[PDB]
Design a protein around this nucleic acid. Structure first.
Length: 133
RNA sequence: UGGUUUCGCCCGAAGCAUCGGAACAAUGAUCACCCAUGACUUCUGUGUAACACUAGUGCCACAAAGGCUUUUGGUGGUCUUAU
């Protein structure tokens, strides 16, 4: 149905992906939520980031968070100075958050990598912490 | 005896801005960059829909991206002197 592109509201997405079920379902919920979120990533606000963070912790995987990472890329969030200064925050499991932070530095680095006078060293440190260095 | 007042020189606290001037600091200007973007395309790549067919794909269509008319606010330093 979602591939037929039917509306999945924000709270709808939270309640939907809120699925503790049989095995091998966390990554399925992850790809579903990444399909639904690649539009806006549960970020129609900036305090919707708490909802999205419970969503990331429910995806409970570095690989799931990386699916959401490429989804954020396919989302192409806004670009303001302070926007990226506050949107370069990353700290998670070091198995595909590696790919996530590296791909974020890559998308921003195709032109003018993050160099907010702190955010560059911050991206380096968070990358090494997520195993992206 | 000290005083007063006056003049001449010697020193020159704060200060007057002039200049002196060169050399920092801030805009103008140079070429490229914190970096998307206005452009859209060749595929290239990439997450997705629609639809017959092989066990999944020409189109769908943002975007991760190179490279484009460029501009652009400012970035970063860049200029030379203009102030």
């Amino acid at each position: 149905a979602a591939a037929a592109a039917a509306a999945a509201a924000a709270a709808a997405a939270a309640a939907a992906a809120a699925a503790a079920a049989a095995a091998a379902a966390a990554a399925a919920a992850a790809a579903a939520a990444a399909a639904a979120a690649a539009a806006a990533a549960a970020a129609a606000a900036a305090a919707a980031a708490a909802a999205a963070a419970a969503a990331a912790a429910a995806a409970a995987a570095a690989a799931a968070a990386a699916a959401a990472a490429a989804a954020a890329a396919a989302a192409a969030a806004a670009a303001a100075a302070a926007a990226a200064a506050a949107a370069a925050a990353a700290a998670a499991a070091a198995a595909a958050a590696a790919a996530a932070a590296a791909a974020a530095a890559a998308a921003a680095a195709a032109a003018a990598a993050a160099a907010a006078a702190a955010a560059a060293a911050a991206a380096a440190a968070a990358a090494a912490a997520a195993a992206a260095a």
